[PDB]
C-alpha cells in the first residue's frame, strides 16, 4: 500500500513510517518489474 499510494509524500516532507509486528514479504518486490533502481547499501537484497 505504500508502493501503491496514489500520491506519494513530498521529497522534503518524506513520510516516515515505523512498521513491526508483521511479516515482510520481499518476494513481491523482486517479482515486480516496475522498479528501475534497486540499489541496496549494507545488506544483500537476496537475504532480505
Amino acid at each position, epitope marked *: 500500500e505504500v508502493f501503491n499510494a496514489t500520491r506519494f509524500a513530498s521529497v522534503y516532507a518524506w513520510n516516515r513510517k515505523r512498521i513491526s509486528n508483521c511479516v515482510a514479504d520481499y518476494s513481491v518486490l*523482486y*517479482n515486480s*518489474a516496475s*522498479f528501475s533502481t534497486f*540499489k*541496496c547499501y*549494507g*545488506v544483500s537484497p*537476496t*537475504k532480505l
Partner: antibody
C-alpha cells in the same frame, strides 16, 4: 560508507595452505553472503565461488571445484579463504564482494605469490 | 558456464568522441517477472579493483554517470560512450548474473 578491508597479502610456499580474511565496516556479515574473486594478471577476470555465513554450502566455479575452499565466520566481521596446491598460475589479485546486482565492493587486492 | 566474448582489440579514439563496443552474451540471459537482463557492466582502472558501471544492463550507478545506457534483449549488450574522459580511460567488464556459474569477459581497453 561501506568498505571491504581484506588482509594484506603474504608470501606463501607451494604445497601449503593460505587463509585470507576480508573485513567489513558499517554492517555485519550475517546479512552478507560475500563472493570471492581472483583476477589473473594480463588475463580475463574469473570468479572463484560463493559462500554464506550460516549454512555456507559453498559452490565454486567448475575450474576451482575441490581446489579453493572458502569458509565464512559467523562473528568477528571476517570470512576466510583457503587455498591448496598453489602454482605459478595461482599468482593473481584477489577481491571481495557484496553480492549485489554486481560485486558492489571489492578488496584492495592481495597478490598470493608462490616462490622460493 | 557461459562463454562471454568482448571486443578483442583496443579502440583508439579521440577525446570527446563516441565509442562502439559490445560483448555478445549467449544463453539469452533473461529472468521471469523482471525483464531487466542480469548482465552488469564494470569499470576497472590500473591500480584499484573494478566498480559497477551498469547493473541490470540499464541502471546508471552514482558517480561519473555519463550515459552508459545499454539496449539489449539478452543476446547482445552495448556500452557506447558519447564522450570519453580521464575516468573513462579504463577497461570495461561485462558479467552474467542470471546463471549461477558466472564468468567475466576478456576486457576492452579504451584510451583517449
Amino acid at each position: 560508507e561501506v568498505q571491504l578491508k581484506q588482509s594484506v597479502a603474504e608470501l606463501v610456499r607451494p604445497g601449503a595452505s593460505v587463509k585470507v580474511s576480508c573485513t567489513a565496516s558499517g554492517f555485519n556479515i550475517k546479512n552478507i553472503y560475500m563472493h570471492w574473486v581472483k583476477q589473473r594478471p594480463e588475463q580475463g577476470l574469473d570468479w572463484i565461488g560463493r559462500i554464506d555465513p550460516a549454512n555456507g554450502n559453498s559452490r565454486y566455479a567448475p575450474k576451482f571445484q575441490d581446489k579453493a575452499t572458502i569458509t565464512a565466520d559467523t562473528s568477528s566481521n571476517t570470512a576466510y579463504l583457503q587455498l591448496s596446491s598453489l602454482t605459478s598460475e595461482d599468482t593473481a589479485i584477489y577481491y571481495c564482494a557484496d553480492e549485489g546486482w554486481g560485486f558492489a565492493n571489492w578488496g584492495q587486492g592481495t597478490l598470493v605469490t608462490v616462490s622460493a | 558456464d557461459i562463454v562471454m566474448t568482448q571486443s578483442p582489440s583496443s579502440l583508439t579514439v579521440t577525446a570527446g568522441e563516441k565509442v562502439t563496443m559490445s560483448c555478445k552474451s549467449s544463453q539469452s540471459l533473461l529472468n521471469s517477472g523482471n525483464q531487466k537482463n542480469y548482465l552488469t557492466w564494470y569499470q576497472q582502472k590500473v591500480g584499484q579493483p573494478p566498480k559497477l558501471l551498469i547493473y541490470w544492463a540499464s541502471t546508471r550507478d552514482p558517480g561519473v554517470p555519463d550515459r552508459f545506457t545499454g539496449s539489449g534483449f539478452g543476446t547482445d549488450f552495448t556500452l557506447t560512450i558519447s564522450s570519453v574522459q580521464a575516468e573513462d580511460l579504463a577497461v570495461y567488464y561485462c558479467q552474467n548474473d542470471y546463471s549461477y556459474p558466472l564468468t567475466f569477459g576478456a576486457g576492452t581497453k579504451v584510451e583517449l
